[PDB]
């Protein structure tokens, strides 16, 4: 079936250190579901990691996981990383995005108030890089405020002017 | 007292997510002692964090901690980050070094075999970025092999040609 006469949305790269596959994996599949609603989620690897037996060394391909992550992260039109408890993938994904990434939204939850790493917090430039606070009960809101200041017509358009 | 008629060594930036101040803090002060022997350690903030009451929010300056870390990390002639258990500062320090850093040595311990993050491992380019394995009983060796392939005359020089 030919695609609708509409343009393609944007892409979102949600980072969320895996190292195994736990509740963060479940929260990731949900968070990934919202980002997947806004546009295309490139970090499909994440969240889609619950399937098959988990355990890092578990079949998967750490190199293939990162390889696609670095390439897609580079193909990401929009990037947001979840943060709360210590995380190497989140720190690397946020640091790499700081330099190779452009639009970077970071999230830290106060419910645990684990004080976001001083590095991610200090990186706070408020110039594409921002550390917003949130909780599973309002994560969608954090993205809603940021995206509301963003997705204006990309969200939907009844008219489709010639390219 | 005027400095000896010798040139200045190199500088080393040892990264080691703090978030509090624990054994990693003690292992950091020691590791920092070896790097401090090779040249100048810019991450003086780390390790030197045991003093005064710890607790992140504890007096210190998360922004000042990162601020100096980012600037010094940029002034680092050599950079090595410790890795083993999940860490946001290590992930960010390694990611930022991947892009802004140049010489980057990463360390992961097999004793716990926590499988280094797929991102740090996948970043394994072996072109300044390398993930070496080690244990508190041989950490100095990891640095000794890397530095042995490095600090040749900078270690010491009886002659001091004009410059």
From Swiss-Prot, chains A, B:
GO biological process, one term: positive regulation of cell growth
Recorded family membership: Belongs to the 2'-deoxynucleoside 5'-phosphate N-hydrolase 1 family.
Protein name per its UniProtKB record: 5-hydroxymethyl-dUMP N-hydrolase
Localization per record: Cytoplasm; Nucleus
GO cellular component: cytoplasm; nucleus
Effect of residue 93 to A: 100-fold increase in Km and 170-fold decrease in catalytic efficiency for dGMP as substrate
Biological function: Part of a nucleotide salvage pathway that eliminates epigenetically modified 5-hydroxymethyl-dCMP (hmdCMP) in a two-step process entailing deamination to cytotoxic 5-hydroxymethyl-dUMP (hmdUMP), followed by its hydrolysis into 5-hydroxymethyluracil (hmU) and 2-deoxy-D-ribose 5-phosphate (deoxyribosephosphate). Catalyzes the second step in that pathway, the hydrolysis of the N-glycosidic bond in hmdUMP, degrading this cytotoxic nucleotide to avoid its genomic integration.
Protein induction: Up-regulated in response to c-Myc and by partial hepatectomy.
EC number of this enzyme: 3.2.2.-
Tissue expression per record: Highly expressed in heart, kidney, liver and spleen. Weakly expressed in lung and skeletal muscle.
Keyword check for Cytoplasm: yes
Residues reported in the UniProt entry to bind 5-hydroxymethyl-dUMP: 16, 18-20, 87, 89, 93, 117
The species this protein was found in: Rattus norvegicus (Rat)
Quaternary structure and partners: Monomer and homodimer.
């Amino acid at each position: 079936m030919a695609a609708s006469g509409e343009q393609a949305p944007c892409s979102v790269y949600f980072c969320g250190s895996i190292r195994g596959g736990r509740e963060d994996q479940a929260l990731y599949a949900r968070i990934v579901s919202r980002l997947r609603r806004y546009g295309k989620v490139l970090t499909e690897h994440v969240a889609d990691a619950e399937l098959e037996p988990l355990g890092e060394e578990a079949a998967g391909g750490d190199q293939f996981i990162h390889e696609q992550d670095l390439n897609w992260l580079q193909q990401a039109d929009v990037v947001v990383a979840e943060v709360t408890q210590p995380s190497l993938g989140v720190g690397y994904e946020l640091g790499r995005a700081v330099a190779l990434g452009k639009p970077i939204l970071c999230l830290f939850r106060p419910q645990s108030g684990r004080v976001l790493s001083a590095m991610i917090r200090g990186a706070a430039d408020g110039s594409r890089f921002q550390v917003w606070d949130y909780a599973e009960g309002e994560v969608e809101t954090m993205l809603d405020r940021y995206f509301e200041a963003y997705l204006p017509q990309k969200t939907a358009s009844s008219s489709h002017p010639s390219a």
